[PDB]
Design a protein around this nucleic acid. Structure first.
Ligand SMILES: [Mg+2]
Ligand SMILES: [Mg+2]
Ligand SMILES: [Mg+2]
Ligand SMILES: [Mg+2]
Ligand SMILES: [Mg+2]
Ligand SMILES: [Mg+2]
Ligand SMILES: [Mg+2]
Ligand SMILES: [Mg+2]
Ligand SMILES: [Mg+2]
Lengths: 102, 155, 83, 127, 14, 213, 100
RNA sequence: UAGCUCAAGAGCAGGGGAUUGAAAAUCCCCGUG
RNA sequence: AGAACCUUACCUGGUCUUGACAUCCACGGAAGUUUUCAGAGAUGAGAAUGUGCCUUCGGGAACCGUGAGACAGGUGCUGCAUGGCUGUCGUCAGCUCGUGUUGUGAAAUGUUGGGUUAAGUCCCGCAACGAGCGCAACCCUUAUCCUUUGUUGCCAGCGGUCCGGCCGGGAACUCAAAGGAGACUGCCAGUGAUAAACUGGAGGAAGGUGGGGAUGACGUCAAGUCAUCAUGGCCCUUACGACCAGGGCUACACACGUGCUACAAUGGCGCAUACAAAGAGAAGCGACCUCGCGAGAGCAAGCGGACCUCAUAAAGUGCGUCGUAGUCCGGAUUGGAGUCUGCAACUCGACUCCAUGAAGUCGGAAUCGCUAGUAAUCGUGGAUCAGAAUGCCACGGUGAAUACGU
């Protein structure tokens, strides 16, 4: 749209990402930017099964999972200061961010 | 069943006549969970039976069961050293089950182009007290009449 | 089988050998440790010692063998009977 | 006005909007007879109606997604049940006794390691 | 026959 | 063929992971092997430095690595030249710059990792296995541990026959994930076979602590 | 697997990497229709000469620590037991017990 | 007199399948001139 | 959780030796490139080419190659040397200890007796009193409500619309992922030693442990694994080490184990046609459109993914469809002919096509699972993976019968 940027946060925890989410939303509102709510998207759960035994006995299998949390926030008004602020802003190492305007 | 007392599961009545008896019948006849084909065969078989003998579907169906339904069976009780075949009266609910069961068994045995054709003739013969299904009732009663002497210790 | 769009596959070592053989009329067996190649019209009438795993079986290429591979004419297992 | 209810049977979620009219139960724009086939399905959806007074005096707007005939049909029935209770707060008695207010919690059991299905186990050999 | 005739037409013969 | 690893079962609730770097299905594979190699290297160079948990975080284009030790002064050194050289050598193995923290290990006795390392050093020096266990147990109990359970397995005493003694004092629950039991493992490479060591230190339930703070 | 087998594996991938560009273009000529018949045949012969190893089908997935040729997993790399080991001690970022 | 032991029958013995922690025993099925 | 070569440890054909990998010093060459040819390939000749980087201006990090040494090397040996992981009894309710007491003593007691419970679960009892690993709970997932949040998800109330949530609009609802709430034997009554417990009943989405999954006590079997690895000792070491070309690991007079598919008219095809979940995907998924029996192919959008893609759900229904036949059942097997994967498809791949159309008409003795969304059923997905699933793992759809009882 009018240069609007959508920010996608990707992590592996249900807390870290929410904690980091507050920072990325509170900042924009503080500087006076309308940031869309931290919409929750389905947490992809990849499921793996592995033989737990070095040899025979193929019933002793284990079930693993990876929960990838992905929150998304939209800022309709791309004010220069806020955009530049979010850029320089450093976020928790645990979470990852894909900054794309489109 | 060692300790767990079991109640009774409620079954939905059949869509057409609203009969609990017939809903159980299609369940026993059903194979591979294919209900839709089961009642279609049964309903068409009932239409043939009703037209071939005049009587209403529901009244005709009940008469066939009444003429095949057994009243006494032989249980297997390990009395003392060696087990004997103890005759035992059968509860009314179980009566319905065995009657319907024999019908389906006898149907599959008989040779006919369509099982619908089978069911119809099968019920018709049962109402006349003839056919394979009713033959079991005398055989079951003969087993329970020849062994009627062992009727003082049951389980 | 192999795709028709790719044509026939032949080993260059064997391929080089047959070229020399045809231009000189050689009759000595062709020593080859390979079997993946296919029968070409230019090998007709030659004798090739095809490896089977331990030894080289001499096979005389004939007219009817055109289009087949060297592998179909070199049995790899020695089987007489179970009794 | 609008009366809302939520139904769920296996994996289907049904949204029911109740407003008076001439019945004509619409299920995902399509008509009743069109959406449902097997006679049993249509009978169960209409069970609460006959059970109460408004058998067809009012109308039923239905949107359903996911699952199959059973799930969808059962969830529609369940939604109607809750919505009628919200409308009258008096149908509980008959509905509760008819086991309609209870949410059917039976779901497909997950597959387990070492078994081919929920409970079926590979054929066993004693010796 | 054909063993060679087939080979001839099927393959481009480069 | 029984008893699961108490750390793993509690890796989401209670116990935290030792690596919290998000990634995808591409870079992830590589990162793992580099983490593997660096940890083994560091453990060899500081097996005598009472290292306990070499936490490794991979921030955006960074690899912050932490080290829990009970002798930080030994590790650092006068003006810490030793720490500085470690950073350089570890960073080249996987590229990218590196920042090193030293999370000092207060009361080393309560850390099962440290205790098992000490016990195994004794066994290499041929110290009466029975003595070692009693010492470690008493040390933890006096320093404050709701429970301790230490297990020893292998060709103890030198004989060719196996053996698995274990001493336990206090509550050492393992079916309550609301606990905080640490279970390190150690492979003492004694002359005869490879005596193994596993220790559970029930430091105390994290009921109030919930999952994280 | 032995250390030697791991050494042979890394040699296979290294050789394929060096000739990766040549193989990609050479097969493109083969695959592409309308190309001269003689050109396609020469391309086939060139691939033969081209070291076998260079083919990406000559690599067997092995554990990056032990080299086990069986039980490999693309995701998480490692191997069967190796995954567990890292995940069990708390080195894999996110894995845990599944109770769905 | 079927490989024995008697009448090309039967049985015994043969094989296979059962049953045996496991083998005889036993059960079945078949080949038995 | 996947032998065409790879793998492979096997055979066999040919190479080779401080060795492929491993250091250590000197040594030579930057490394490296491009090509030629010997040859099955290993290995072996040839060339041309560059000849660096780093301080420093020598020589160094390198690297490639020679030699010497020490060593390297074994999927060699030993699981009755071990670690470690795993099976098992058994999710069975048990196993213990302290202290005291008793008995010469090994032991006993606690831990049992009367109740109760899924339970050494609780209650009385009581030379025991305490404790602890279990049990239970704490976890995850499902079931109803709330709040928060509206994405691409949603579309009620909106009006316009191409009738397409499409597009404005909106935040209703679905859905989602966070916080929560909620079932507690709590409540009600009954029974029971005035207990513990049980029983019914109300309420309630949900009743006794609401439904799963996770979680295996002390130990047993000198259970299995040295070929994951580590490791102890022995043995090997121009070879029991290593390279590479071909085969074998798919051999077949033979028996079993586990799957699959059929022995049909619940079918059997034809057409029409309704409804899912779960996933995966960047050298990948690949819309499309065009061609091709098909398989495919060209053509190439988009998609790192609640957006695009795989993608068709099929069981089901609508009419028609044949008449019990080895069948319009089923339909292995082959005689061929295409595509596709890949150095490479014969041994020994997979799919599409032609032609072929068996056995098999519910299977002796025997023996398996299962008691609910289970069995039975019918799809779909996914890991492994160049390609190669009736195997495994998941995910839906449909959907029973039976329990007097011990
Ligand atoms: Mg491959
Ligand atoms: Mg091979
Ligand atoms: Mg053993
Ligand atoms: Mg005592
Ligand atoms: Mg207890
Ligand atoms: Mg428990
Ligand atoms: Mg043993
Ligand atoms: Mg063994
Ligand atoms: Mg095999």
């Amino acid at each position: 749209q009018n240069q609007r940027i959508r920010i996608r946060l990707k992590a592996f925890d249900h807390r870290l990402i929410d904690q980091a989410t507050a920072e990325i939303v509170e900042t924009a509102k503080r500087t006076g930017a309308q940031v869309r709510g931290p919409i929750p998207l389905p947490t992809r759960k990849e499921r793996f099964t592995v033989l737990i035994s070095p040899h025979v006995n193929k019933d002793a299998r284990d079930q693993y999972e990876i929960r990838t949390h992905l929150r998304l926030v939209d800022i309709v008004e791309p004010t220069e200061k806020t955009v530049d602020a979010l850029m320089r802003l450093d976020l928790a190492a645990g979470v990852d961010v894909q900054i794309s305007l489109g | 069943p060692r300790r767990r007392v079991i109640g009774q599961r409620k079954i939905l009545p059949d869509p057409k006549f609203g009969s609990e008896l017939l809903a159980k019948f299609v369940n026993i006849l059903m194979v591979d969970g294919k209900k839709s084909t089961a009642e279609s065969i049964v309903y068409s078989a009932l239409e043939t039976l009703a037209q071939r003998s005049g009587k209403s579907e529901l009244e005709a169906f009940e008469v066939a069961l009444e003429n095949v339904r057994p009243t006494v069976e032989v249980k297997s009780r390990r009395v003392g050293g060696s087990t004997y075949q103890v005759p035992v009266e059968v509860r009314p609910v179980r009566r319905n089950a065995l009657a319907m069961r024999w019908i389906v068994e006898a149907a599959r045995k008989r040779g006919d182009k369509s099982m619908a054709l089978r069911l119809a003739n099968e019920l018709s013969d049962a109402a006349e007290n003839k056919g394979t299904a009713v033959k079991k009732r005398e055989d079951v009663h003969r087993m329970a009449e020849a062994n009627k002497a062992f009727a003082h210790y049951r389980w | 089988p192999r795709s028709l769009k790719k044509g026939p596959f032949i080993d260059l070592h064997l391929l080089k050998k047959v070229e020399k053989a045809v231009e000189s009329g050689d009759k000595k067996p062709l020593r080859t440790w390979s079997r993946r190649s296919t029968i070409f019209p230019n090998m007709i009438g030659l004798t090739i010692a095809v490896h089977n795993g331990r030894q080289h079986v001499p096979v005389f290429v004939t007219d009817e063998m055109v289009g087949h591979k060297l592998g179909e004419f070199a049995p790899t297992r020695t089987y007489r009977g179970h009794a | 006005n609008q009366y809302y209810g939520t139904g769920r049977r296996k994996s289907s979620a049904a949204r029911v909007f109740i407003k008076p009219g001439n019945g004509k139960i619409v299920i995902n724009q399509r008509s009743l007879e069109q959406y449902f086939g097997r006679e049993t399905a249509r009978m169960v959806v209409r069970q609460p109606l006959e059970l109460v007074d408004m058998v067809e005096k009012l109308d039923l707007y239905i949107t359903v997604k996911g699952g199959g005939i059973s799930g969808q049909a059962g969830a529609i029935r369940h939604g109607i049940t809750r919505a009628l209770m919200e409308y009258d707060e008096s149908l509980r008695s008959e509905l509760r006794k008819a086991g309609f207010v209870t949410r059917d919690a039976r779901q497909v059991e997950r597959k387990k390691v070492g078994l081919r299905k929920a409970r079926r186990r590979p054929q066993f050999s004693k010796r | 026959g054909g063993r060679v005739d087939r080979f001839n037409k099927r393959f481009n013969i480069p | 063929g029984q008893k699961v690893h108490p750390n793993g079962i509690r890796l989401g609730i209670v116990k935290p992971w030792n690596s919290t770097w998000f990634a995808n299905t591409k870079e992830f594979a590589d990162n793992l092997d580099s983490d593997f190699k660096v940890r083994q290297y560091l453990t060899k160079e500081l097996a005598k430095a009472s290292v306990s948990r070499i936490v490794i975080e991979r921030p955006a284009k960074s690899i912050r690595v932490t080290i829990h030790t009970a002798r930080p002064g030994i590790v650092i050194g006068k003006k810490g030249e030793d720490v500085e050289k470690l950073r350089k050598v570890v960073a080249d193995i996987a590229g990218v710059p590196a920042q090193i923290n030293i999370a000092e290990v207060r009361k080393p006795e309560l850390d099962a990792k440290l205790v098992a390392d000490s016990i195994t050093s004794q066994l290499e020096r041929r110290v009466m296995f029975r003595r070692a266990m009693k010492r470690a147990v008493q040390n933890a109990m006096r320093l404050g541990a709701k429970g301790i359970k230490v297990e020893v397995s292998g060709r103890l005493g030198g004989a060719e026959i196996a053996r698995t003694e274990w001493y336990r004092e206090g509550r050492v629950p393992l079916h309550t994930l609301r606990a905080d039991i640490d279970y390190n493992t150690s492979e003492a490479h004694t002359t005869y076979g490879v005596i193994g060591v596993k220790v559970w230190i029930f430091k105390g339930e994290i009921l109030g602590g919930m999952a994280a703070v | 697997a032995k250390q030697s087998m791991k050494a042979r594996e890394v040699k296979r991938v290294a050789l394929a990497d060096k000739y990766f560009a040549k193989r990609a273009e050479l097969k493109a000529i083969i695959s592409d229709v309308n190309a001269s018949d003689e050109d396609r045949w020469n391309a086939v012969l060139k691939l033969q000469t081209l070291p076998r190893d260079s083919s990406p089908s000559r690599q067997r997935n092995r554990c990056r620590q032990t080299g086990r040729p069986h039980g490999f997993l693309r995701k998480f790399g490692l191997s069967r037991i190796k995954v567990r080991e890292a995940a069990m001690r708390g080195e894999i970022p996110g894995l845990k017990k599944a109770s769905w």
